[PDB]
Amino acid sequence: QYSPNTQQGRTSIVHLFEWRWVDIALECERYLAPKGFGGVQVSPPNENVAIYNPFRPWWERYQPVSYKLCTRSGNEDEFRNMVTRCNNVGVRIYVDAVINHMCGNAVSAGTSSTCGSYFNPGSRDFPAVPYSGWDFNDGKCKTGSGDIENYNDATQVRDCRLTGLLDLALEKDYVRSKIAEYMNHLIDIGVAGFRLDASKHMWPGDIKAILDKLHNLNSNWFPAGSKPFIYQEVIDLGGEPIKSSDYFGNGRVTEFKYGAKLGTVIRKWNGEKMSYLKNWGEGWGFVPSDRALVFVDNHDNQRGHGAGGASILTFWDARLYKMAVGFMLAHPYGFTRVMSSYRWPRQFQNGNDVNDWVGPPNNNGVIKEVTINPDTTCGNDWVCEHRWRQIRNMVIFRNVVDGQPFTNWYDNGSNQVAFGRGNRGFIVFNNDDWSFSLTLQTGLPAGTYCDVISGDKINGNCTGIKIYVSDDGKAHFSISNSAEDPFIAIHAESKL
Ligand SMILES: [Ca+2]
Numbered sequence: 001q002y003s004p005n006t007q008q009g010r011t012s013i014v015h016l017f018e019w020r021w022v023d024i025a026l027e028c029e030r031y032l033a034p035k036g037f038g039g040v041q042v043s044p045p046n047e048n049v050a051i052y053n054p055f056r057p058w059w060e061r062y063q064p065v066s067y068k069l070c071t072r073s074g075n076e077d078e079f080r081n082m083v084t085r086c087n088n089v090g091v092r093i094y095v096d097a098v099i100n101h102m103c104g105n106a107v108s109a110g111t112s113s114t115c116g117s118y119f120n121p122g123s124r125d126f127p128a129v130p131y132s133g134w135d136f137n138d139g140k141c142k143t144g145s146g147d148i149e150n151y152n153d154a155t156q157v158r159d160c161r162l163t164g165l166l167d168l169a170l171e172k173d174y175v176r177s178k179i180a181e182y183m184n185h186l187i188d189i190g191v192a193g194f195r196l197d198a199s200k201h202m203w204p205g206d207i208k209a210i211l212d213k214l215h216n217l218n219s220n221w222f223p224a225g226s227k228p229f230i231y232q233e234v235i236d237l238g239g240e241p242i243k244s245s246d247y248f249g250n251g252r253v254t255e256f257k258y259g260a261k262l263g264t265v266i267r268k269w270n271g272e273k274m275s276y277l278k279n280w281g282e283g284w285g286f287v288p289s290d291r292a293l294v295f296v297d298n299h300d301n302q303r304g305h306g307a308g309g310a311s312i313l314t315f316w317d318a319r320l321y322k323m324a325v326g327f328m329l330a331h332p333y334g335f336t337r338v339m340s341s342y343r344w345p346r347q348f349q350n351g352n353d354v355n356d357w358v359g360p361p362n363n364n365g366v367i368k369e370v371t372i373n374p375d376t377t378c379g380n381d382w383v384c385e386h387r388w389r390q391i392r393n394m395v396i397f398r399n400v401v402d403g404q405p406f407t408n409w410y411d412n413g414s415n416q417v418a419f420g421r422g423n424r425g426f427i428v429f430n431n432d433d434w435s436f437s438l439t440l441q442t443g444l445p446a447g448t449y450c451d452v453i454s455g456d457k458i459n460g461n462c463t464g465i466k467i468y469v470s471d472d473g474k475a476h477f478s479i480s481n482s483a484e485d486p487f488i489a490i491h492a493e494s495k496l
């Protein structure tokens with residue numbers, strides 16, 4: 001469960017948040033495969049409640065109605081088509097698995113669901129699975145409200161309703177079987193793994209129990225005995241009874257301290273500075289590199305939704321964001337996930353975005369197609385951070401240097417730092433209020449290298465900055481504090 005199952009030499013996955021299946025299929029072939037992306041994390045493919053007030057929020061997808069593959073992203077055929085097309089070009093699919101709960105206990109019964117299936121939250125009847133009142137933790141929860149009231153109580157965190165969502169009785173073999181059934185349906189179509197939503201709210205053992213019921217990966221695309229990659233969503237900043245280490249037996253875990261700390265450092269808050277990143281990694285109290293899934297931001301926290309808080313860097317902070325994502329992709333710690341978002345009408349009222357619920361770009365609830373502009377960026381309110389030159393080029397950087405050790409670290413004691421990856425890549429950052437202009441040891445073979453942040457290596461030349469490495473691996477670097485992108489990156493494959 002620890003191996004992502006990506007094609008050799010593909011080191012990252014992209015979250016194509018709320019995208020339609022047909023658009024992901026196209027994206028795999030026209031961009032992901034040619035640009036070296038290892039895989040895609042998709043939004044929950046199972047039927048959810050259609051919430052009309054507010055109007056179709058992104059969060060309605062974390063409120064399952066059934067295990068039917070029918071959502072605003074598309075139907076089963078479309079999902080199967082996408083997995084096929086993606087796998088055939090060597091781009092893997094990771095399904096966001098929503099298995100700790102069903103919908104909010106207070107949603108109205110009926111058929112307001114993405115696939116029209118009937119449901120009755122009130123009576124706990126989910127006839128499309130089916131599930132009944134006997135499959136929930138109602139009798140287990142011991143909180144007054146039936147909801148999680150105390151995060152210092154571990155039992156509570158797992159048997160009570162997270163924000164009122166109907167908590168499934170995961171110790172029951174019937175429940176475990178229904179979920180494994182859904183997951184096995186996905187494995188057979190061709191998925192390579194799963195993001196386990198709200199793992200913190202589930203006992204490690206119950207998760208184990210479900211995993212034991214799973215099939216090996218599709219033998220048409222994976223080697224026999226291949227196990228699905230598992231990464232569990234556990235929010236573990238310090239101090240709670242639940243530790244992320246309690247989930248290592250099941251797979252990797254999301255390292256939420258990563259983006260929270262990186263954000264503080266890049267923003268230069270709390271007396272933090274880039275020179276402190278010399279020992280970034282476990283040295284910072286993070287989980288072992290072999291069990292981490294890292295990222296700058298995720299779908300929840302880029303909304304100010306406190307899974308790292310105010311220090312989280314997002315596409316909204318484009319300059320600092322490219323820097324942070326570049327740092328993450330060059331650094332050997334963990335397995336990296338890149339975020340791809342949609343723009344929404346952010347409207348702050350007393351430090352709160354009143355429109356943090358806004359769903360993907362739509363026309364009366366129908367998700368708008370991902371359009372591609374002449375310059376390769378996207379239209380229709382899709383941000384497509386994965387298509388920003390500085391980001392896609394750093395995805396490539398990570399593939400080129402895979403396996404190379406962290407070396408040739410430099411720092412000015414402030415926010416000007418540089419580091420290499422073996423003899424295959426070198427990166428330099430200027431986050432200080434003055435220019436950087438120094439000759440550094442890069443550990444790279446002599447030559448002219450294209451800077452992949454400002455441009456690209458295209459048919460024997462560079463469209464951006466050219467770096468000259470002398471015979472002794474030294475190269476001069478100049479970076480103005482007012483540069484658009486105050487960082488430079490060169491690698492074995494950007495050399496002319
Ligand atoms: Ca639970």
Ligand SMILES: [Cl-]
Pocket residue numbers: 233254298
């Ligand atoms: Cl996540």
